[PDB]
Ligand binder design. Structure first.
Ligand SMILES: O=P(O)(O)C(Nc1cncc(-c2ccc(OC3CC3)cc2)c1)P(=O)(O)O
Ligand SMILES: O=P(O)(O)C(Nc1cncc(-c2ccc(OC3CC3)cc2)c1)P(=O)(O)O
Ligand SMILES: [Mg+2]
Ligand SMILES: [Mg+2]
Ligand SMILES: [Mg+2]
Ligand SMILES: [Mg+2]
Ligand SMILES: [Mg+2]
Ligand SMILES: [Mg+2]
Lengths: 344, 344
């Protein structure tokens, strides 16, 4: 597993990241820099680092070994950490917005005593650190502007997606007719697929001098479909995953979300089951959440997910055969192996 | 008043801004684009537009009339609106973090029914719109990267400042010893002075081809001091301003903030008054807030502010004599006239 190979060096670059962002010229901001170090240590560390690692792995596979010198590698590990900072920004904010309880095996940052809504600022600081790192490591490289624009555009797309997520899930307002497959695909494309799948591979592409519109469009055809699958898996794991593996408690039913689970339910339900769903969805009561889960189990949605995972894998692999060239297929296969059969 | 001169054209460019950000290629995101239009209309409109207008006014004074063609002006009005979008991002988030009630004469966006913490996303979308506009209007200009970096750096500095604001004001944790003049100056420099004063003038400087390190450092010496004064005035108006002019209810005492008022109080108080301050600061109770205000009145802080405003004006005007050249002094005088004697 190429992610295992690269992982140790990537994780150890984090001290470096923390040291370059937390230092000398302005001691008047030291208390703020100390707080940033706490935010970084609590929120950017404890995941799987798959999005950032995808940058590094892809870079190694796209760049000739002769061009993978010491400084080129520091830049690739830095840009990977930029992706992880992006994720950390997003998760901190999303946990607030979703009223989540745990994340990565610990209490959400905003739930910690003495943090609360100051987390809004902490999150945005994480976002700022991306642009600082790109400037400190990549400003003299011919891909600098391409990466700045990629991160900014990926944030915009992701924020548009999140707007669709929140709008399709108004609190205390159950209208099941909104929850369609078409709407679902739109939400997940924007909220998850661009940043989680296109972004890291595209960053590596740009670092390797692959800036062509056509090469980017082809990669995207693979990567956005991978991303859809990933978010479907995320939705399934929200309810049916083991939290000691996922590291977080699910909130989709209580938060009235347009999950893949509820879309599948709606496609299968009898009128009677529809009414049960309607009376019990989008509400905080533990027994109403439990009724919805029982309904999903009654309608064999775990088995449906397992079948969808098989079919989607196949479809993605077909897209790799179709759209990988002229890049090495391993770039996409490494990422597919990571996500398929994930229960994490 | 040069701000009055420029204002009408600037405000009417807002329809244009809204039309270019809210349209054709992706109807799947229309609901999100509709929501963005609502956010823009509620939050970016109803202020004084002074920060954005400073861009336009400065641009006109720094660029030869022969170079102030139709497209150059659209770009300058767009970059002004980018500054206003930045402000709107910041105010939406800050109102949440400060538990504020009103802003610009209406209920804060997050307090509106059916908004709540979804405002965190709405705020960040406003931030994203800045980079979209810079790309759509300025990408082929030799100052493009300079402006991207300026906005990003100004956001970072502002977020560092906000971190110092929140840290020096922990909820329910009164320690008056933290509230020093030195700490105060640091907070306001970072949280307010960079983005409100250096940013708009520097953007115009860059648009006019003035990119020199020395020219920027000189402007900054004026503009950061102006910004300190502005935030002192903001702190004074938090308590002693008329909300029908300011458009917002103050929260500094309840929120335990390191305001200029509390720093001045601490410098003047007897041990007995110190104890009163200590027992009544940083608490939600209306009568405790009222006691603090009575103490500030007893210690003549309104008269102290009026004297400080005179001395600061003088000092700023001295800095303009010192540091304006080779730019026209009017660039700085127009902005000083706007802020001095402001009660708004
Ligand atoms: O990890 P989670 O299961 O909570 C997923 N989290 C997730 C997935 N994709 C995008 C986001 C996201 C991105 C930006 C956000 O806010 C921007 C201003 C920060 C909020 C959430 C968050 P989701 O809530 O969609 O099930
Ligand atoms: O208009 P207000 O009186 O509320 C002032 N508002 C203000 C002044 N300077 C900076 C900010 C600001 C900037 C960024 C923020 O959050 C970033 C993630 C958005 C929050 C607040 C907010 P303050 O709270 O400092 O008295
Ligand atoms: Mg979530
Ligand atoms: Mg969410
Ligand atoms: Mg989820
Ligand atoms: Mg405030
Ligand atoms: Mg504030
Ligand atoms: Mg204030």
């Amino acid at each position: 597993d190429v992610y295992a190979q690269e992982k140790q060096d990537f994780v150890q670059h984090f001290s470096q990241i923390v040291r370059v962002l937390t230092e000398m010229g302005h001691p008047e901001i030291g208390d703020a820099i100390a707080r940033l170090k706490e935010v970084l240590e609590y929120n950017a560390i404890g995941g799987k680092y798959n999005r950032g690692l995808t940058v590094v792995v892809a870079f190694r596979e796209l760049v000739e070994p002769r061009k993978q010198d010491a400084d080129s590698l520091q830049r690739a590990w830095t840009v990977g950490w930029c992706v992880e900072l992006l994720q950390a920004f997003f998760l901190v904010a999303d946990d607030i917005m979703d009223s989540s309880l745990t994340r990565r095996g610990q209490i959400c940052w905003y739930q910690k005593p003495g943090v609360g809504l100051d987390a809004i600022n902490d999150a945005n600081l994480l976002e700022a650190c991306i642009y600082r790192l790109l400037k400190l490591y990549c400003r003299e490289q011919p891909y600098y502007l391409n990466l700045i624009e990629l991160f900014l555009q990926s944030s915009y797309q992701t924020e548009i997606g999140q707007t669709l997520d929140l709008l399709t899930a108004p609190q205390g307002n159950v209208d099941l007719v909104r929850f369609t497959e078409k709407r679902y695909k739109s939400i997940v494309k924007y909220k998850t697929a661009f940043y989680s799948f296109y972004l890291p591979i595209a960053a590596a592409m740009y670092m390797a001098g692959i800036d062509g519109e056509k090469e980017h469009a082809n990669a995207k055809k693979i990567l956005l479909e991978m991303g859809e699958f990933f978010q479907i898996q995320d939705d399934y794991l929200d309810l049916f995953g083991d939290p000691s593996v996922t590291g977080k408690i699910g909130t989709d039913i209580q938060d009235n979300k347009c999950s893949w689970l509820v879309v599948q339910c709606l496609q299968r339900a009898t009128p009677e089951q529809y009414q049960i769903l309607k009376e019990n969805y989008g509400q905080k009561e533990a027994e109403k959440v439990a009724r919805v889960k029982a309904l999903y189990e009654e309608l064999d949605l775990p088995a449906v997910f397992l079948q969808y995972e098989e079919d989607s894998y196949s479809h993605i692999m077909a897209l790799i055969e179709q759209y990988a060239a002229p890049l090495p297929p391993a770039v996409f296969l490494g990422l597919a192996r990571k996500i398929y059969k994930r229960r994490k």
